[PDB]
Amino acid sequence: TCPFYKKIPGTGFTVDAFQYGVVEGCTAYFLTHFHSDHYAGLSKHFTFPVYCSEITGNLLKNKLHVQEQYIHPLPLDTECIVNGVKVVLLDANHCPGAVMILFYLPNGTVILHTGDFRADPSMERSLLADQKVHMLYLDTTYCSPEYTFPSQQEVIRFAINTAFEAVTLNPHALVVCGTYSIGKEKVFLAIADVLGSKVGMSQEKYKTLQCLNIPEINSLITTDMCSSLVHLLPMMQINFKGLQSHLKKCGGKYNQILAFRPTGWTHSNKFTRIADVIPQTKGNISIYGIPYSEHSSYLEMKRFVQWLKPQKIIPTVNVGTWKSRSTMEKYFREWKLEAGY
């Protein structure tokens, strides 16, 4: 049954709560983004209203086959009334279609639910700049100071330069990129763009990416693998055995593979700067792990929260252990005492 931190008090609303059957009192189910832990439970048989972005709605219809009558897309940055309550969707700087939700409760309380997000100073000039937020439901994925990583821009610079150098030295090299969900599309699109190639992939992944309704992405994708020198594969295949096996299938077109595994944070970020990163190599196959995050660093999160000055914080990630909960609560108090709210 549905946990407390997925319920919006004083409303009939839940957020990212599709795996609990019918939720008692829920008149509308919000979905922040199309990632499996959040949508878990949705299908063609779902018969309650779903509120989400246009992009999330495209994915619900085409990938999970939710019936069109139950899909309620809302535009971003626009005041909307849902079951007698004013709501706003804001871009979360996470994966495509991902939103934060502002709820204006009838009693005068204002609640921000971040969904999953990567906090940025640009959010300090959204529709958030006006008004007070009483409660914040916060993506606390990396809420500890050990979690550091580069900007997305620096990581893409490293990837483009690495790929361009390798293929300029060896015109017969293949670039492979790993994927298990939507998000992080810039990695493979930026590499294909510098190499003058389209990105080749399965029919299933092409369809998933087609549901994002964006011409720029559409010009750079294909299902014709043979005509492409940047290939996408499932993340589980990005290992020496899986890549060896893939290389056999290309029919003596290539004699080297350079592969990228976009991860989140890993312990190596404690030690090694992005510019100094080196691959794992076996024979004619090299694999780079690159720290491309779509969640806030500790410092990004702290800056956002200290700016917003919420009266109460409810974490939505790392909620299962007393150690985690106690650590997060200590940081929230430090931030409050330093900033004076």
Ligand SMILES: N#CNc1nc2ccccc2[nH]1
């Ligand atoms: N909206 C949205 N997501 C989005 N749009 C893109 C355009 C180019 C490359 C990656 C992209 N991701």
Ligand SMILES: N#CNc1nc2ccccc2[nH]1
């Ligand atoms: N001759 C020549 N160019 C060339 N071929 C390579 C294959 C693998 C790695 C580096 C290489 N450079």
Ligand SMILES: N#CNc1nc2ccccc2[nH]1
């Ligand atoms: N302070 C702190 N960390 C912490 N608090 C706990 C409470 C119960 C079990 C493990 C725990 N770890």
Ligand code: NI
């Ligand atoms: Ni997510």
